[PDB]
């Protein structure tokens, strides 16, 4: 089975300080018609480890994440919109990659992962000078009409961190003590969303890693260089989610809706 999205679908637009507002205008326009938005992020993942007590492995997972979202800043964030069937405007960019202002010298990093990230294709000069200011960003994203609307559907893959950074950016405050509050915030800010990684897990588990590229390969998509970018990442997870939700009419093999695992994090 070969799945070959229309060429314009594969176009990812770099956003910098310079073009932030225009792109956000476009976004603001498309969101009504294309109500599925998918998110990806890129950071050092240099994780500090919290020590002490907590509670089950989730309170530990949460605690670690919290600590890290707090101590770290995302270098890049991808976004992608499409309609529920995974259609995108035949005209103009439907996928953005926002590049935040990130100074290696001023932020947590190891020449190790600095060089690994340069190989990844991050240009730290551009990010230093031309980088988006996350305050501006958070502000545009607030009234854009993606957040806080049952109408919009958010799509994420292995979301703990990605949703962490996002909610952190929106809150403009230190992440909460506990998973519970963090979740009140997630559900407030994004009332409708799916973790593709969990839906896929569950699916693969009838007829029984889960890496997105596996889901992608089974779905038929070629491996285009573009998919490795952060933006590309959001693209891929959106194409994959939409295709998969079409095939199965968002029903699991057993006839219960994907909607059961709406709101459900991790994977």
């Amino acid at each position: 089975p070969i799945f070959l999205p229309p060429p314009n679908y594969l176009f990812v637009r770099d956003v910098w300080k310079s073009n932030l507002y225009s792109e956000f205008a476009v976004i603001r326009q498309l969101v009504s018609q294309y109500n599925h938005v998918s998110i990806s992020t890129e950071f050092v993942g240099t994780l500090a480890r919290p020590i002490g007590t907590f509670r089950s492995k989730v309170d530990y997972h949460y605690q670690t994440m919290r600590a890290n979202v707090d101590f770290l800043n995302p270098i890049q964030l991808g976004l992608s919109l499409s309609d529920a069937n995974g259609n995108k405007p035949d005209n103009g960019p439907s996928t953005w990659q926002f590049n935040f202002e990130f100074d290696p010298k001023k932020e947590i990093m190891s020449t190790e992962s600095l060089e690994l990230l340069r190989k990844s294709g991050i240009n730290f000069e551009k990010h230093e000078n031309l980088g988006i200011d996350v305050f501006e960003f958070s502000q545009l994203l607030m009234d854009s009409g993606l957040m806080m609307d049952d109408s919009v559907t958010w799509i994420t893959y292995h979301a703990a961190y990605d949703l962490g950074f996002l909610i952190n950016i929106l809150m403009n405050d230190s992440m909460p003590n506990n998973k519970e509050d963090f979740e009140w915030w997630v559900h407030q800010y994004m009332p409708n969303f799916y973790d593709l990684n969990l839906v896929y897990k569950i699916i693969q588990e009838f007829k029984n890693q889960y890496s997105l590229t596996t889901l992608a390969d089974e779905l038929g998509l070629p491996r285009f260089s573009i998919f490795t970018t952060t933006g590309g990442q959001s693209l891929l997870m959106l194409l994959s989610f939409c295709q998969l939700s079409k095939l199965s009419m968002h029903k699991f093999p057993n006839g219960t809706d994907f909607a059961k695992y709406q709101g459900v994090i991790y994977g």
Binding site: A48, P50, A67, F71, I108, E112, N177, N178, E180
Partner: protein, 318 residues
């Protein structure tokens, strides 16, 4: 060539401090340190195994000091942070916004500096800078007075900031080994830690001013340990209170006062062991316990963790 370097560990010269339980503990604990290299987040792992039942440096410290003692006779929760051995050439000031932190292990990275915001960490008790690239340590690490164990091994650190021994409670300080000026090493060998801490407290250099009440029974050193011991003594604080009171010509002096020193000192007029007497803002009261009121140059009040101190002979002010 550094592991055998004399300029690093000066105990390849002695040859034997290996007797001196001081630089003995320096060596045992410096080796427990340099053991932990190579694995990301030791303290968190170790604590994995511990919680279950690879020991600790904090715990090896606690023991070895305990043996030096044997032979001298909804939520709040988790307090420790582990950045160990994932080789990091920087830190986002953000970690310091976490003030419930009592532990903070930074060892085995590339840190060439420590952000001053560390001072915002005030509940710190352990701190490990071991095996980083540090050229020198910040002042204002001294606002960290609650510190129990503090390790920076293997770094190149020449001088200590003064500031500390502004830190009273410090039990262990691992210095082994960095090309220290050797005089600090001197006070440390045989005066131990507080030998050195106090050395620092008591000789800092003069700390000037731009410009512009503790009865002695209550002034006990146990309580104010940041005030260089001489400044604390009533001999000094009498004189100071005098020059203070005299410069300020106020027609009504309400003094906040031992009875004896009123009817001996203060009488040369006014009226009234303890008491209060009468003749004819950011803080009234400055201490690491509570800085509040019940204005003096604040760049001056920085670089002090409380009063009374060199020029202000009470934790209160006029």
């Amino acid at each position: 060539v550094n592991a055998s370097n004399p300029l690093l560990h000066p105990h390849l010269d002695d040859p034997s401090l290996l007797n001196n339980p001081i630089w003995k503990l320096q060596l045992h604990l410096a080796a427990v340190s340099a053991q932990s290299l190579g694995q990301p987040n030791i303290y968190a792992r170790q604590n994995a195994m511990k919680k279950y039942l690879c020991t600790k440096q904090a715990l090896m410290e606690m023991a070895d000091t305990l043996t030096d003692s044997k032979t001298a006779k909804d939520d709040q929760l988790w307090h420790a942070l582990d950045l160990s051995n994932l080789q990091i050439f920087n830190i986002s000031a953000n970690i310091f916004k976490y003030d419930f932190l009592t532990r903070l292990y930074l060892n085995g990275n590339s840190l060439t500096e420590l952000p001053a915001e560390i001072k915002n960490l005030s509940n710190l008790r352990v701190l490990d800078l071991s095996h980083n690239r540090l050229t020198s340590l910040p002042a204002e690490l001294g606002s960290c007075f609650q510190l129990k164990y503090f390790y920076f091994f293997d770094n190149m650190v020449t001088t200590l900031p003064w500031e500390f021994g502004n830190l009273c409670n410090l039990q262990f300080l691992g210095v082994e080994g960095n090309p220290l000026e050797k005089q600090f090493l001197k006070i440390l060998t045989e005066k131990s830690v507080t030998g050195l801490i106090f050395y620092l407290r008591d000789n800092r250099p003069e700390i000037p001013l731009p410009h512009e009440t503790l009865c002695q029974h209550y002034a006990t050193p146990k309580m104010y340990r940041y005030t260089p011991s001489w400044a604390l003594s009533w001999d000094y604080r009498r004189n100071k209170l005098k020059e203070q009171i005299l410069s300020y010509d106020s027609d009504l002096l309400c003094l906040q006062v031992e009875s004896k020193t009123f009817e001996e000192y203060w009488v040369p007029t006014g009226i009234f062991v303890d008491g209060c007497c009468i003749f004819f803002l950011p803080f009234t009261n400055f201490t690491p316990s509570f800085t509040d009121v019940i204005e003096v140059d604040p760049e001056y009040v920085s670089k002090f963790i409380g009063f009374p101190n060199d020029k202000f002979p009470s934790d209160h002010i006029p």
